[model samples]
Target: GLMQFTLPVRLCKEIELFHFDIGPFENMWPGIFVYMVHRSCGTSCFELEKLCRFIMSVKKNYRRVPYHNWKHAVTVAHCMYAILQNNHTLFTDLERKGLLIACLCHDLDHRGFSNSYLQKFDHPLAALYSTSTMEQHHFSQTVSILQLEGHNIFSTLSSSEYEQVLEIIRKAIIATDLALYFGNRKQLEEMYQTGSLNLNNQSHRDRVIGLMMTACDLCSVTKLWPVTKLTANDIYAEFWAEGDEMKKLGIQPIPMMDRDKKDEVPQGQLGFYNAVAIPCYTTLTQILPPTEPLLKACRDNLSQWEKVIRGEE
Candidate 1:
């Protein structure tokens, strides 16, 4: 009672979280996701047409923002899938499906602007949510897409199961905000330090889920150096474009966003690695040791940035 799509088995291995060369297969992501989900949730749980339609609609909802577009969503989903693949028992079946969907739709409809930009400019999105402005909109847009005719991928689930999965999706989507991660990281780190990090505890599991979202969201930093460089280029290009927009309104964007300060890029990457990427992945690897590759690659990228700063690269 289900349709199936087939992707190469080797392709599956290549897209794992530790491997950074999934860039070339961007066009095949839809099929890859279809195959991945079918493998996870089983053929009985999804109608192939509806599943494909749901994913396509999610992709369509993503505006062609320089970095927060469909490609980013797809990559994030792949990273989450890879994580789930390595730790099969860490999440229940429903939770696994929920996390993947959350990743896929997390940045839906992003308009290439950060939360600070929206709030400072009095954008309507800022008015809608006092905090987590863009993330809230992304979650709302995800719901809108799911409600569209034939877009309900979880159609076969019981009512309560559907609600539970939606809750998982909501929390995971909102957790992608770096500010939220910053607030939660220390507490989770202490839990790990005190050996109180019990996955059986629902709150503990929820916190882990949140941290995992940030890890996967920033997975680009853990990729091969060239892949990481490519992502940084796209990110700065987007940031500088925003700065240009700010200048039109007589507002000076931060130095990181300003195109004229491009020379500061290496320092910016190093700061991000130390302050955000390193700490976040360090906490994650503490919780799940198998995810050490993420932290290792992140550390490698940080070193690469140092070499660039020193004119050694």
Candidate 2:
């Protein structure tokens, strides 16, 4: 809400140069959203000026955290955009819109801390939401922006359609919370393996969207070598910031969070891949074959991490 200026024509023109595979476009985060919205919903559904204002406002809301900042949000949105581009039939237009919007807004107003960190510290967001604390706050932040003047890009929707997209955006944003993903993955994978995951079923569809959100959320790990390492450095910087705070408070952080355990990161990343990231992408690619490249990227990154552990990097 702080910044309400429109995106200038010069920068908007650069949206044409935007691509998902590129490195961080730190200054053009809002432009990336502009490009994504045009692709997902087209200009008729989203007034271009209002869309620009909403994205600019959303960017203003994000804190300059080491990892969960505006850049990370746009990167996640780009990943969703790329997935939707290659496989248009995977989700309806409205669903695609919700997914991209949710990806862009999922970490809005983030405080550079994890959900567990907030819960352990009894942060106000934890008091507000019984579970998925930060995720809930992120969705609330999205709603606040939409209510702002000239920021309601969903204005073209009929009342019922608006509600549908809002519901999709809320669920999709909350889906980035890894806690829920851990619980849902088994059931989702089982349904896919057993052929019971019908896209026509509303619950099934919702669950699939949840998986897709996580897939996009962690897409940085699937990036090419240099990009992946750059992202990982930012991620660890944020993690260690939290750990440093905990240490100052007399609470010892976990191995992964502790700055002293920097040497252990390669092993930690390998553990993350095997336990969470690999299963997530593998299930997603199996369910949506068009996303096979994402799985390949995930595997390729896994090899890089293995090489790191072997001291080959």
Candidate 3:
């Protein structure tokens, strides 16, 4: 999801002007951090923003109840911010800025369901884009919005500055795919081993920003207690709704909501958390200690989910 909602013209204008005046590369260290990573890594802010705006514009756009709105976007943004703060030593000021921007805009136009929706419906997005091209389209749209005459946020940036911004945005946005989870984790582990992460460097910087953004998006259970619960509920509801939709379309439901009598949604999620997320986050905590609380929160949530599956909660 690229642009989920319509940014008020004024707000959009304001952001655009701010980026233009300060140059997404200027003193806004956080924005710069994000911009540099995306730009250097090959992403398009304009397209991402457009997709975000589009998502906001569509009605009945979300298959799930909770995940359909701006809350998910804000949550991911918050997670990214926290992760950046936690790993401040691994990022330069500029890199931090870029990561922040990417997190804020990653799921800009999400439809509240999985990418499967596009494929199932033979939607234009699906037909026009192969797995590789879909991301490129989203990234390009972000760039398109930014390059539009009056809307260009990087209008004031020198060619070099603009390039840096694009690279960072791309890396961050593309990394949002949950499918990349393992590879991202591996990269993060490698960085930890190196003991030196130079955010100013373009090549590896992309990987860092991408991994951080994706990690934050998937780390919902690792948030504070209340936040974690809310995220879990939202995600669960969304999955259920998506399953319902698939049923209507005569399409088979995926794992979480699959109708097979033996397949319990709650149990499936619990298994996913225990088998995949928990171990990954547990290892992540060793290299990035700030994530410990969130991981602990996730563990607690897993217990709750287990209870719920057994009718205990």
TM-score of every candidate relative to the true structure: 0.96, 0.92, 0.68
lDDT of 1 at 146: 89
- Among these predictions, the greatest TM-score belongs to 1
Q: Which pairs, if any, clash in model 2? A: none
After TM-score superposition, what is the CA distance of residue 227 in candidate 2 from its true location, in Å? 0.6
**What ranking emerges by lDDT with the best candidate at the front?**
1, 2, 3
lDDT (Cα, 0-100) at 150 in candidate 1: 93
How far is 4's C-alpha from truth in model 2 (Å)?
22
Off by over 4 Å in 1: 1-4, 24-26
Task: List candidate 2 stretches off by more than 4 Å.
Answer: 1-19, 22-24
Over the stretch 1-313, how does candidate 3's per-residue lDDT look in tens digits?
Answer: 2323333355334332211111222124333333433433235443555433433332122223466444454446556655655564775544554565556556655666667766786777777765733455546656655554455545545788767777887877787776676776776677667866555666656665565565566766665445555556677777777788888889888767544433466777788887667866665676567667656776887887788788876
User: Could you tally the backbone clashes for each prediction?
Assistant: 0, 0, 56
The deviation in Å at residue 128 for candidate 1 is: 0.9
